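ASSEMBLY PREDICTION REQUEST
Request ID: AP-0331
Submitted by: J.K., bench scientist
Number of chains: four
Total residues: 1024
Priority: normal
Notes: Please return the full assembly, not individual chains.
Input sequences:
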Amino acid sequence: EKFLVIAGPCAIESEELLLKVGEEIKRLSEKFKEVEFVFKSSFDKANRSSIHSFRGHGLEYGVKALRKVKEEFGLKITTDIHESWQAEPVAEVADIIQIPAFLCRQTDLLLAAAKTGRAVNVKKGQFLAPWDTKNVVEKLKFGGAKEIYLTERGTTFGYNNLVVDFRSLPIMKQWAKVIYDATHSVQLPGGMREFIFPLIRAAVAVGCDGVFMETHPEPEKALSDASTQLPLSQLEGIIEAILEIREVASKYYETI
Amino acid sequence: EKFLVIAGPCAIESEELLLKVGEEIKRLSEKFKEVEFVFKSSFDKANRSSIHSFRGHGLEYGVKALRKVKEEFGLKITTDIHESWQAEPVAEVADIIQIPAFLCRQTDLLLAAAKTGRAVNVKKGQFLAPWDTKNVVEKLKFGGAKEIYLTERGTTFGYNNLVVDFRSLPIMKQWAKVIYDATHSVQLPGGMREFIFPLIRAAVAVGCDGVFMETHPEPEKALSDASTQLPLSQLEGIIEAILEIREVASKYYETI
Amino acid sequence: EKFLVIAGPCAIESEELLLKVGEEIKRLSEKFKEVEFVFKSSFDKANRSSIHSFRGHGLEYGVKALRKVKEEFGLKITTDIHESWQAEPVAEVADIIQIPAFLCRQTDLLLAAAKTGRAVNVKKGQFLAPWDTKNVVEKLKFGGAKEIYLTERGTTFGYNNLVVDFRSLPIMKQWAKVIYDATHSVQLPGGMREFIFPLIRAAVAVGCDGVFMETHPEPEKALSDASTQLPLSQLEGIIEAILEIREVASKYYETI
Amino acid sequence: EKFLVIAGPCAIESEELLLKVGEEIKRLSEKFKEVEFVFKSSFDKANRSSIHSFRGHGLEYGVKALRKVKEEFGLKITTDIHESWQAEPVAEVADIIQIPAFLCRQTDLLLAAAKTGRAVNVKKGQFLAPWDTKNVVEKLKFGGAKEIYLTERGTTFGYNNLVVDFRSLPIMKQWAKVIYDATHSVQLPGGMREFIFPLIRAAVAVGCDGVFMETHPEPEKALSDASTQLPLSQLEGIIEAILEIREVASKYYETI
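STATUS: Completed
Returned structure:
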């Protein structure tokens, strides 16, 4: 099956930033034809820890910038919603509607996304056990979702730390396609970037249906997740690496 | 102020149920004049695990039932909101607006609640560290809130289990009044009731500004948190118990 | 039943140190006649993190110093063993043989202690679940132990941190007398002392059969656990406090 | 050096069993010349949960059986010690002395093992953080050890569960060769086998110096770790699989 690579800048800092990253993702989509790329970027960081941190330039501006990426590069789009009313307007551009990790249990948000007819990708809450996602998928199917993804992005492990329990990949695969979030899994809520590559190698070795990676031309200047966003120049190499490891490991992937 | 006791049935199964519980809380209110009682009940269980579980009768029916309790018994009210638009209509009756644990980082919800001018009680997310709540308080203050509470309700401890780290009480006290949720702290996400009383005794021994307890005439028949809701008949005894323990222990509560 | 207070300097830094602390413990035993005091001090810190840290002056010297405390003050004694061969010589002076937390599953060590005829107190391993202690007690009974204690000293919670799950007290009480370790529970393996008092208040409010507290005339100069040992001058006040909280809470202690 | 594969039956149920497994490991040894095989089996399960569980036939019978394996198949040997006095007699046959996870902080055991001049493999305690292993290595070096291994076997994650934090592999590599224990990492202290292969694939994808795997002709009849021991017949396939994954992934292993 075609491997999914969801990548892009964490937040829509500007339409310019989006086009710069989109240009590269487009180039890679022409090279890695066996991969289905989906451009990701949040129009709003609605859950920052601090009231003083960057949130975004609004829904309107964001959807407009994303529409530009899709129009200029012909790339599929995904962005996250935070309240039910956002599903409809976002669905006009987003091929995949993303559900934030803290909101993976909010029934109305999941239902709002499901009825748009668009694909839905739910970030597994840091408080959720792998088997607890069966009901999340059930809600989505109940709401009309026909293409569902579950994203592994780490689990609460003590204070200000997350651990990736890779047993979650084969467990969640029982009821949905599985995506591994390579950048949020190494973040320290409220010794990070150095683990992005090794853990993503682990993910494809275990087996998943895609990977999610935030990338920015200059991470140190990013207005969000400056500590975990992958330098854009490193994207091509990481992708080639995971495709290689996926290929050699693939014959051993267990059947669900 | 005086010790706060937030109690009531988990969900508004019917205003009839609210009246029955309100009557008992009213009585206790007259018996323990040194305690400030606040009647609690959710008009919607917006985060149930299963799509087939009870959610409620809607915001309108709920606010109406809560109005009936306040008018008929002169009791302060508190209920939780799940999306920003709900803050205003709920504030019409709620003296304290409650913010769900999973939603404690949603900036707009916090701001929406703070804008109503009402007091705000934020349930500490199971993924949050005690010190990470300082930023939560700051968002509310920025939003104009002046009466702010933080509620301890357990922290993710492995899968399908929560642990109460009592160190959180003195830590959170540095920036807000602290409430201990005696019923949700012992629930196993996705042997419970036997630990409610023991842990509530610990909470007052350590020191807090109030306690939160869901109570129902017949917990076994409750449509929500049936396994953890306290039988109404046992409420008086537990309240008297914590007041006695508090009276003695308060002598040793650390400053700030 | 007579409450147990196990206290003393973490390590036997010198026989002099022991006599100084013993003198105070003796004074308190004359005042708090409802408490059974047991003087504690390790002849060897066999599990320090660093090879460069203080361990002790040997078994011989330690047993001799402890015998002096018992002889001069008439106080019961307890110390921990690390290998089976130490049970016999230690049993000559120790009224209670202590089993280290990391060694709570070593069958031969538990058996060696049990056959001495002395009481045995097992520190619950940081890796052990409360219900997992039933088998620990079974081994001891199998080995002839007639007086058994289980000590709560925290559970692994993320890296370099421990949490006290107070549900462990009533659970372990099902098969043994329960002791709460007030000083090791707040240590950060490999923001500490300020939590000793509040957590011990929680322990007696929930209900336990005794408390364990390391105390040193000048903690900052201690050769071990300098961050958690309680200043000797503060011991009397803490003990009075827990006896008061125990008394008022006692009528609510659940029957096992 | 070459990739290390430590394999064998959990416990020495009989030297007969050891010979049968040794024969298969010998064969694979001749098939994969690029791999250094080490036969493992414990002469005593000194930390079983229950007093009524299988421990073994003693140190003498065990060392004799292990001798038979080395003599008959020319295979290197490894077994674990539980008390200091055992290091010397065990070193007579063991090329690698194994230190139990619960005992990774017992200074005398580590020193005793290091004194034999043999290589030492320390199982990382379920309570230890990856960086806390630096001090473990230092103890062994101080004791004269020169060939040191650290084995990843899971970390305490809530009650009766272990999680493998793969970030530990690159961290521990800073001061010792790293081995991944594929069978104990999925055991539930106090759905297991299905995760052995997936996680071992992750381990080599991330990068380690070897893998540890308990194997038995008929796991269902094993007297120890029956639920996690790999059927002997499946050993060849898994080894070939990890060698192929390692071959491809090694290109991306980070330096130090």
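REVIEWER COMMENTS: Residues 1-256 of chain A form a domain with the TIM Barrel fold (CATH 3.20.20.70).
SIGN-OFF: pending second reviewer
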